[model samples]
Target: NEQLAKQKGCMACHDLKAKVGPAYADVAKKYAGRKDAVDYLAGKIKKGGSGVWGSVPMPPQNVTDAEAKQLAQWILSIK
Candidate 1:
């Protein structure tokens, strides 16, 4: 999350350093260890971020289901 947010300029409009979208840590906690967490996230894979996360319009991140799973797992593991 931090990497993408920085490398991809995802932080341009958003900020973990500040608070544009839900903090990655919060996202992880929200979906923590849940089986459906990845599936639900997969829906946003091609669709992009929406109300569930925020109005950021995640920009069709092109992430895969497997990737979403990984991302969800990481996010859910946030402290």
Candidate 2:
């Protein structure tokens, strides 16, 4: 699952600590109280953006919604 993300460039910007994209812990903290994290981030990951994590622009992925959800879960688990 994450292997696909890493292969598809999700790891290019994100990291466990700090990164051009939001760190794993940072994302876990930000969405800590949100139950809709997967749905919300699935859309974001599907769309992509900058000003999200600093000024870094995250490009859209060529993955399925199922893949996005899996990634969302993994990211939130960075807690």
Candidate 3:
């Protein structure tokens, strides 16, 4: 889903390490072992959010639900 992330513009803000937004690794750490991590992250991916990572808000993405879920799953899998 790396190509998907790039296509969806997630890479413009986030990275494996901290950048304009929190790293995927950090996100994975924060939500580690949560039963709702995938769903919650998918929602955030589509609708966007702020405060959890930082004051800089993540804007809503133009991805479909399936794409969002796929991306979320990929992100949560990051080590």
Candidate 4:
């Protein structure tokens, strides 16, 4: 999934620490304990959204549903 992230250009905007987007760890923390985190984040990964992380919107990504879910799960696993 890390390689998938790089291949899909996610690394350009995000990092383990905040960059153009929020840190992956922070995202994991914010959504921690949510049963719907995977589905919600997967949706966000593919369709993008704003306001949750401030005014800078997260642009939609080009990953497929399977890939998006994989990435979301991987992100939520980060400590």
Which tens-of-lDDT digit does each residue in 2-67 have in candidate 4? Answer: 899999999888997656688899899999999999999999999987767865668999999999
Candidates 3 and 4: which is better by lDDT? 4
TM-score of each: 0.42, 0.58, 0.63, 0.64
Summarize candidate 2's per-residue lDDT along 3-72 as a digit string, tens digits.
8879889988888665567887788899989999989988998898767655666899988999999999
| TM-score of model number 4 | 0.64
> Root-mean-square deviation of each candidate, in angstroms?
18.2, 18.0, 17.5, 17.6
Backbone clash count, each prediction separately: 2, 0, 0, 0
- Name model 3 segments beyond 4 Å from true: 55-79
lDDT order of candidates, top first? 4, 3, 2, 1
Name the top TM-score candidate: 4
Tens-place lDDT digits, model 1, residues 11-68: 6655453245666557678789888988886675446765666454556778989998
Model 2 weakest 10-residue run by lDDT: 49-58
For TM-score, candidate 1 versus 3, the one ahead is 3
The whole-model C-alpha lDDT of candidate 1 against the native structure comes to: 0.68
Cα lDDT tens digits, model 3, 1-79, are 7799999888988887655678898899999999999999999989986777666678999999999999999999998
Model 1 earns a TM-score of: 0.42
For model 2, state the Cα shift of residue 1 in Å.
4.1
Clashing pairs in 3: none
